[PDB]
Design a protein around this nucleic acid. Sequence first.
RNA 1: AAAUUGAAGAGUUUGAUCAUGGCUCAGAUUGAACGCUGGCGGCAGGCCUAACACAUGCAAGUCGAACGGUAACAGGAAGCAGCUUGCUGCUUCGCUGACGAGUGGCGGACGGGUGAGUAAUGUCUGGGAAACUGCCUGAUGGAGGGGGAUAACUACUGGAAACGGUAGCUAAUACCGCAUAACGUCGCAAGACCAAAGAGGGGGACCUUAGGGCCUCUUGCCAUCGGAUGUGCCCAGAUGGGAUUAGCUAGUAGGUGGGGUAACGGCUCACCUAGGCGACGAUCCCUAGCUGGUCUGAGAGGAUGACCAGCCACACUGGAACUGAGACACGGUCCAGACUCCUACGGGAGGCAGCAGUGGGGAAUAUUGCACAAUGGGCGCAAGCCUGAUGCAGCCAUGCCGCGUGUAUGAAGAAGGCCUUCGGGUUGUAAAGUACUUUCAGCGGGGAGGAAGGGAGUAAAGUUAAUACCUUUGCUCAUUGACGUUACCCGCAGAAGAAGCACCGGCUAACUCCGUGCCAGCAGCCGCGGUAAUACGGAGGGUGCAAGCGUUAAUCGGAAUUACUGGGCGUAAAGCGCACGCAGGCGGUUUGUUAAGUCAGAUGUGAAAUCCCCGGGCUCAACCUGGGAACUGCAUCUGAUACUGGCAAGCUUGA
Lengths: 86, 81, 79, 205
Amino acid sequence: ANIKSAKKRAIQSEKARKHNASRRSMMRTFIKKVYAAIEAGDKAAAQKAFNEMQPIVDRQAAKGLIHKNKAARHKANLTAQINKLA
Amino acid sequence: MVTIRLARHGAKKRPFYQVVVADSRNARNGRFIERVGFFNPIASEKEEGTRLDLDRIAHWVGQGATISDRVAALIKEVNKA
Amino acid sequence: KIRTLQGRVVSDKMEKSIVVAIERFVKHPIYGKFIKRTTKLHVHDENNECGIGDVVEIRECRPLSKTKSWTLVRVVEKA
Amino acid sequence: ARYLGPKLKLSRREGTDLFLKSGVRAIDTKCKIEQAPGQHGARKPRLSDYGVQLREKQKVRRIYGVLERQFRNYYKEAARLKGNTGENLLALLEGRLDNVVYRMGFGATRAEARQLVSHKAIMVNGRVVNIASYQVSPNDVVSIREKAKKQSRVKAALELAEQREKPTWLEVDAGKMEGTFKRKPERSDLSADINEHLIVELYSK
RNA sequence: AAAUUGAAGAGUUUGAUCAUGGCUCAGAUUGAACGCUGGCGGCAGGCCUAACACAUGCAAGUCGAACGGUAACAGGAAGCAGCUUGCUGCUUCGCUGACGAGUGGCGGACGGGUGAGUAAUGUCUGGGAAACUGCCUGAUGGAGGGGGAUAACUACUGGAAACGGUAGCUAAUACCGCAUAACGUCGCAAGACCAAAGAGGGGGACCUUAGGGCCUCUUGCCAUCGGAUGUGCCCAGAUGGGAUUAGCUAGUAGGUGGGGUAACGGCUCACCUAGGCGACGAUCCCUAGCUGGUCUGAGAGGAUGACCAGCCACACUGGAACUGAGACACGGUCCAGACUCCUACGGGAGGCAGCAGUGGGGAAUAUUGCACAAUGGGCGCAAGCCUGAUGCAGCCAUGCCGCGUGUAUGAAGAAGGCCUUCGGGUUGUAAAGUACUUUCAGCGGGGAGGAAGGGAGUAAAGUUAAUACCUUUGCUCAUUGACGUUACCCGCAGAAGAAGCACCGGCUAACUCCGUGCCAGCAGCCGCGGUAAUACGGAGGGUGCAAGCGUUAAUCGGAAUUACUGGGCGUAAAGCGCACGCAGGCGGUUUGUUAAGUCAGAUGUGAAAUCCCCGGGCUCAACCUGGGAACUGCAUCUGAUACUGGCAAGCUUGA
Ligand SMILES: [Cu+]
Ligand SMILES: [K+]
Ligand SMILES: [K+]
Ligand SMILES: [K+]
Ligand SMILES: [K+]
Ligand SMILES: [K+]
Ligand SMILES: [K+]
Ligand SMILES: [K+]
Ligand SMILES: [K+]
Ligand SMILES: [K+]
Ligand SMILES: [K+]
Ligand SMILES: [K+]
Ligand SMILES: [K+]
Ligand SMILES: [K+]
Ligand SMILES: [K+]
Ligand SMILES: [K+]
Ligand SMILES: [K+]
Ligand SMILES: [K+]
Ligand SMILES: [K+]
Ligand SMILES: [K+]
Ligand SMILES: [K+]
Ligand SMILES: [K+]
Ligand SMILES: [K+]
Ligand SMILES: [K+]
Ligand SMILES: [K+]
Ligand SMILES: [K+]
Ligand SMILES: [K+]
Ligand SMILES: [Mg+2]
Ligand SMILES: [Mg+2]
Ligand SMILES: [Mg+2]
Ligand SMILES: [Mg+2]
Ligand SMILES: [Mg+2]
Ligand SMILES: [Mg+2]
Ligand SMILES: [Mg+2]
Ligand SMILES: [Mg+2]
Ligand SMILES: [Mg+2]
Ligand SMILES: [Mg+2]
Ligand SMILES: [Mg+2]
Ligand SMILES: [Mg+2]
Ligand SMILES: [Mg+2]
Ligand SMILES: [Mg+2]
Ligand SMILES: [Mg+2]
Ligand SMILES: [Mg+2]
Ligand SMILES: [Mg+2]
Ligand SMILES: [Mg+2]
Ligand SMILES: [Mg+2]
Ligand SMILES: [Mg+2]
Ligand SMILES: [Mg+2]
Ligand SMILES: [Mg+2]
Ligand SMILES: [Mg+2]
Ligand SMILES: [Mg+2]
Ligand SMILES: [Mg+2]
Ligand SMILES: [Mg+2]
Ligand SMILES: [Mg+2]
Ligand SMILES: [Mg+2]
Ligand SMILES: [Mg+2]
Ligand SMILES: [Mg+2]
Ligand SMILES: [Mg+2]
Ligand SMILES: [Mg+2]
Ligand SMILES: [Mg+2]
Ligand SMILES: [Mg+2]
Ligand SMILES: [Mg+2]
């Protein structure tokens, strides 16, 4: 980089990338827990995993890592799949 | 944001400003939303040196447009007839 | 009201889809003669009511597949 | 940008007096006006139709002291303006400031009036104008400058002016050396020896 | 009112003619180039080729009113001393004005460049639904209580450098929980779940340490619903050439389900159906940024897309994502490649299609300038800083427009030149001479406008506990111009400093002599040159333009010579050898109906600029500018029904 502000922006963006990546992995792990519970066919476990998942995606959407529409999509899809497990 | 400012037209050493509403990001003489007046700084006597559509300006200000300093001064001068 | 086209079904072999030919009558820009032009549209046909040769009635909607952005309103005439 | 050669050769080529001299003498006593200039000037010129059109246009140009680019612009303006194109062209030529000064009589010739205009000795509506091609509007006042009122050539031009016909579209006071351009001259008020339709046809070739 | 005032031919085939038919010329124009020549000014324009390679300088920062801090320098405070009797110099303290480096916010996605790619992925016109949107703006509510880090810094250390490594300390409007949770998210519902940040000015009782949470004000933070703007997406019509490219396509076409996106969608995956496009030209090949517009044309058309503005695409080449409201990012990141460079040989650095400039290519295209004074943009409460945007300046007759290079008189019709039938004629009022003026250039003096604002004071009003702060409105005081020796005005001097280029047989305005002798040469065509050349070359004279004039290139015109307007086919080029016939084009006559074509009106849109009309300002003009007209189109709505089309019923004259 040739401009001082560009250099600082690169440093800041790398730090932001690490932070974002850890949060994104965490959220994905919880969603995958819900999906695995649905796959196993255990409705109670699926509901428990969904309950643990919901605040995480909501908080991430509020923080701006994902969008509100994406959080809503996750919640709606998982609720629809869980309700059919009966 | 939306702003009300002057676009410089005319000739060399003889500027003539068009008072326009525009997205502030556009170039000074570029894309604009609506033309609302003009201002000639070298207008001769008995010649209209400033004209503004105050109704349109007020409409855009109510919609949330900002105003450049020169346009604000021109509005003040026009209102002080 | 709603803008709306009317045409003739030229294919119905797709599942819930039809091809509709719309005819326009326009003056030739140079020679002035009125000529016929055809536009073929992919139309969503739920219940698969339409058949080849029927005169059908279509409107514009959101995309439904790669080539489908129109949907069937009613069947004006049946072959 | 100005013809600076002998003046009577132009009138000899055009076969008529172009008023390029003051008029204190006779054109016949000053030159062989009936003879075209040059070694072969005694020959009888058979002129084609293009030649006739060209000679008429050149005659008008030499009368008013206008070069070709300006004259073509005058013709374009005359064609653009509503009405008869040839009459519009003549009116535009007569509206020139140097011509107006000459007709008012402050200059013995159009060249002298042009020099007076150029040297900042002429005022229009109370402002100094030194553009020979300035267009004079109706009700305008053309006056001699106070520092130029003492010039003897102005008095000579004034005493030569009344020896000719008085233009009826102007109102001149020689005591104060100032005139009013009452209105644009009509076609009738201009010379009948000018065939402007030839110029109009020439510019359509 | 006004805004469609518009249309020329000529030469050449023949012994001659009429026709046909090509070729050639006169016009206008240009980002032009070249040759000759060259005075001034105004406005504009200036790498069309190598999207070739680039030395050097500059083109993006800013905020201390978010934060820890103190590298400076400037004060304040303590001591000492040459002391020069309190002026100086050296140390200790961030205590203040401030501020290097650092954390954090915002900007860097704008502004600027280029046209490589792109033939519809784009662009233009008109519609549309399944979306997000920083800064700005409206409304309703919140802004409680905690925690763990980390740069800077300190110590040690690796490396030539670039760049790191280890340990320890610290702050926030950096980061993360907890609480709060409804016009928000999920859900039929019940229910479940999600946020935040402080800073600054002033102050009495200062409720407590001279500060603050004690009050007030300003500003900032969070949630939701709106506005505005911007962006993403879908559809129809239009937008080059080639058929000596006729078949193309397997995520291909559609469906269901899962995933994915801000959002619809084969966007992606699994399965099912076997579809989808194409002679109304698919696929393939060549060329190409598109538009408003520009040139030409009487128009219809034809050609074109430089400058200005809108849209798109690209940023050394290929690929990728990260951050972010927004980028798959010209002056950011990563990988690979080619070149250039540094190296201690381990390893590192770079991207002018930003402005200026260099080399190179080319027939050809400019200065390594001044200033942020104005307009606009970034950050900032502001002051202000940054801004090769922009405003200006330099170079170039590149274009357009204006002006000057003098005016009047002057026969001796002077000399000299050229021609001469030797009489004379022409150059020619031309010159000389005589009277005059002095634009422009030169010199000296005066002198607008582009300046709005901002800063200090004040008085009033609004706020509050407060004559405090803050805001607003007036008034007062000093100021802000790169251009710049500005435009412009006045004075001095003296015609004094200022004319060339092409052509002259016909088209085509303009004629003689001499030289040469099918030679030298000219030439757009017809042609010219053979010893009396108006055609070659010089001269005299003349013609046309004129600070320009010629030549070359290129487009339209003339060319009704691709003919829609507006042509032809017996013999000039041209009727398939003759038919049948699908698609296609066309359709006798009457009534009813429909209203698709057609017609009328209205509404929305058709950006601004450009063109045109009427005006205004630069002394005029070019140029700038107000309003209108126009944008001949598209869509929608409402009407008309003669004609064409659809539908229904007929009729008999075509069959
Ligand atoms: Cu090394
Ligand atoms: K910063
Ligand atoms: K679908
Ligand atoms: K006319
Ligand atoms: K011939
Ligand atoms: K011919
Ligand atoms: K022949
Ligand atoms: K014969
Ligand atoms: K940014
Ligand atoms: K291109
Ligand atoms: K908190
Ligand atoms: K406070
Ligand atoms: K507050
Ligand atoms: K696909
Ligand atoms: K699908
Ligand atoms: K799908
Ligand atoms: K045209
Ligand atoms: K065009
Ligand atoms: K590329
Ligand atoms: K940019
Ligand atoms: K500025
Ligand atoms: K003589
Ligand atoms: K004040
Ligand atoms: K001889
Ligand atoms: K025809
Ligand atoms: K209709
Ligand atoms: K009908
Ligand atoms: Mg790097
Ligand atoms: Mg000129
Ligand atoms: Mg012959
Ligand atoms: Mg280029
Ligand atoms: Mg700088
Ligand atoms: Mg600092
Ligand atoms: Mg935060
Ligand atoms: Mg919570
Ligand atoms: Mg084109
Ligand atoms: Mg789609
Ligand atoms: Mg290209
Ligand atoms: Mg024509
Ligand atoms: Mg372009
Ligand atoms: Mg390059
Ligand atoms: Mg992101
Ligand atoms: Mg891009
Ligand atoms: Mg960038
Ligand atoms: Mg660069
Ligand atoms: Mg450059
Ligand atoms: Mg070269
Ligand atoms: Mg001068
Ligand atoms: Mg002023
Ligand atoms: Mg002739
Ligand atoms: Mg001879
Ligand atoms: Mg010759
Ligand atoms: Mg033609
Ligand atoms: Mg013919
Ligand atoms: Mg024959
Ligand atoms: Mg024949
Ligand atoms: Mg036959
Ligand atoms: Mg037949
Ligand atoms: Mg019929
Ligand atoms: Mg327009
Ligand atoms: Mg109008
Ligand atoms: Mg009918």
